[model samples]
Target: MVSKGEELFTGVVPILVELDGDVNGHKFSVSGEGEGDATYGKLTLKFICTTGKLPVPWPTLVTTLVQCFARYPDHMKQHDFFKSAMPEGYVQERTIFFKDDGNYKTRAEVKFEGDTLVNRIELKGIDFKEDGNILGHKLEYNAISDNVYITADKQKNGIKANFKIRHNIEDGSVQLADHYQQNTPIGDGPVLLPDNHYLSTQAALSKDPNEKRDHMVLLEFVTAAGI
Candidate 1:
């Protein structure tokens, strides 16, 4: 049987919905929720891409985004670029490399807090060049949570969550910026209860993937106590 005291980790994607900005750039929202008891948790992540337009049809776009977010590194690993961000005493559990699959590797850290998830972060690689110039790639999301569900859901969804991010624009020489926000929605899906089992999905879809590809899009992913 799975030990209640053992840490559980898995990969999931988020949904990106409605964009509210110029065609060049848009503000999109993604969402996901968790179901769990006191010891274990289950998460359903969603990603919504509301940029220029979806290359594929809406339904297909949703499926693709869902699969992408559900890929490895479910926002629970660290990136090589942000090695300095981690605090001391934080134990590194595993490292997932996607290099062979044409993706960047992700490292995970577990900060145990008396049987509850105290803190966790995932570093994602965003390709800027067509040739996969990772040295110049950007670190998209780095999410963390504390005292999971310490209070009532600010959105009244019964699951307490928070989010943070690190965007590496040009290179280590130029730091785009770092952001931290609390009590935010995981994505664009309808709110969820603690026991609900549904992962959020997010993506940027366009009727013409090339024609309408010039826009800066963002995803809001949150972490919760999983099942």
Candidate 2:
């Protein structure tokens, strides 16, 4: 039940999550570029724009954790006493010790209430003050209006944020050009997260006592661009 010591930022932690909203009426500004690993890359994400530009082709909630790799080096096994985990394939699958990406900084924003949409992300790193008790290095996320969850004290003291786009129509914009039919639509490839994502209790940890590598990885998904 032991053998661990990987690292972050190398295994994955490439972000670009920036989105804004109105929903349904679509008065929008869209963004969601990815790069995370483990926890199945933020359970798969997809978002786009350009209806005359910016609107529709969105289901972007949020989940850009700082850790992952509870399994899936081959799914592992054993569920009796909750014993089984994998992913020792290199850099250990990481869970946040990443360096530079400008020392990691995200100031995301997306809003909506009754119909889902509220992934207000904000972070500035130094391993987020690493628990010595600062609550200041800062980190704040608010999902669960649709998704993007973080517990165990927002996964170890890093929340408490209380803060927080675009275009027109075309043949219905050709349905925004069908957004992505693998044709001339916005381009698609790394898409997951409730594309009927079965089940994954990915982020919800802390206080496992007796010390066992703390744990990390809340969201993961790598690929997608165009700020």
Candidate 3:
């Protein structure tokens, strides 16, 4: 039996799906949801998505981004430079070193100010230009209600992307939406390509002690045609 306090502490919330739909002719289904402690910091909600046979960059891009956030600290530690030094609560700076097939050495500057974390990458030798930021201080966490709000931004290949994510503690549900735009030549222009996504989850709890709560998550990939 799980007590409410224990459940809240562990973020063991569940999800309930209201709709199962498709986007861009891709199969989508909602699964379950829950909350848990963050490996890097505070607390977070868990979401499960069973996307069917999707093609091309959707899977790769979405998976990579999610992994980037879920295992941020671990990813940074993979490099020797960051392995020795990790960011803490205060203001500071760190550098991450990277090496690629061409024997090219790359570096990224990570800056932490207050609760905000920013990563600036050098791409002269690298194949990609990347920048990442976590506006941690701006995030809203309500322990009493178990809700959380996050705002983050990333830049890749001259495109700036903004993300807004929320976790409904009371229902053990989650929602996320992100949009992209160009950053150069005109700076901050609307995204010329169809590159936006939305995700939502609901929680369904069971009265039976033997039956745990379930979560239903829905994801949609939108393109220029649908935009």
Candidate 4:
């Protein structure tokens, strides 16, 4: 195995990604950018409100992200494997990165495909390592026909992270759990991962202690290889 130092020397390169989310009759757009060097990488992401009020606020967004990171600190181990396969002196780079922040900039795009409303988002950032190599990354996300609802803003807190909320179309009720299910009243159907197995069904509750409304959802599952 390559030493940790060697991996850092390889430097990470940013790649563009497209994300599409369909919620309550409304679609929100998101763009993601990533940066990392040898030891670590960070993804900067933003959301654009195409049809309704932003689902989650800036404070709740950051808190939710930190919570996930705490649960999945070794995400690199669970996901990025190509990084460990490069031979000495061989050029290695990262092609995929997930967004972990919620306070960044999200530009809104207004467009339509058929009856669904389409929104566009863009992100930009760098991948750098302690070894001094940097990679430029950018992404674009388009959300279509996703459910979005308006809620009362209770209070404001300053934190760095991102969270999400799902609304029910039948009753206009918001849910704080994962929206993936075969006959779930919220989402259409199963949420599929790159590996093809059904996505996790775990859900996340609101992180704010004083907040009564649920702020996000979770996808929980079990596998021979835990993620």
Off by over 4 Å in 4: 1-9, 44-227
Model 4, span 1-227: residue lDDT tens: 43332343244433222333332222343333232233332222332333344333322222122011111123323332222222211111111122232122222232222322222333222232212111111211111122211111112111111223332222343323221111101122221111211111222222335534323222212111233
TM-score, each model? 0.24, 0.22, 0.20, 0.26
Residues 111-186, model 1: lDDT tens digits? 2233233223333333223333223233332222222122324353322222221222334432222221122223
**Per-model root-mean-square deviation over C-alphas:** 16.4, 20.5, 20.4, 19.7
Model 1 worst lDDT run, 10 consecutive residues: 60-69
Q: Kindly give the stretch of ten consecutive residues in candidate 4 with the minimal lDDT sum.
A: 133-142
TM-score for predicted model 4 compared with the true structure: 0.26
At residue 182, give the lDDT of candidate 3. 22
Ranking by lDDT: 1, 2, 4, 3
Instruction: Write model 2 residue lDDT over 164-197, tens digit each, in one string.
Output: 0011122121100010000010112211111111
lDDT of candidate model 1 versus the reference: 0.25
Runs off by more than 4 Å, candidate 1: 1-16, 22-155, 173-192, 195-226
State in Å the error of residue 215, model 2: 25
